[PDB]
Design a protein around this ligand. Sequence first.
Ligand SMILES: COc1cc(Cl)ccc1CC(=O)N1CCC[C@H](C(N)=O)C1
Ligand SMILES: [Zn+2]
Length: 139
Amino acid sequence: SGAIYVGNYRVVNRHLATHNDWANLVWEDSSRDLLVSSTTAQGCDTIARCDCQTGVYYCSSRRKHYPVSFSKPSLIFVEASEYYPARYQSHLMLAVGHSEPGDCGGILRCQHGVVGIVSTGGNGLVGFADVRDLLWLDE
Ligand SMILES: COc1cc(Cl)ccc1CC(=O)N1CCC[C@H](C(N)=O)C1
Ligand SMILES: [Zn+2]
């Protein structure tokens, strides 16, 4: 679990969104595993606007932050689950690192702010759903 709170928005993994998130839906994209819902209170998380390929992510399964090098946002094949059939997930970035299913939602950050959230993993790899292209999160 885990979410990004910026302005009047909440960004979460689409597969972990709540009834409240869906009743306050702003935008969702199955192909990216993202859902954005509206909030009454303000969020102060700074979203990075950069092409950083290094950063730090939070791993709840280890109660630790890990530094990682990560790939450019791209279309990567992701195997089936109780949430999705097997498909290409877009805007996905991989790093060599530890993750487990309950790690989805952990934030990846660079020196410029929030880059994205944990969305996939397996085989010593961890995948992050990029959010740096969602320019409207600030305005
Ligand atoms: C961090 O997630 C891990 C990690 C490991 Cl090692 C093993 C399994 C998972 C879970 C995972 O990748 N899923 C299930 C939830 C939806 C995801 C998606 N974006 O399509 C795919
Ligand atoms: Zn950056």
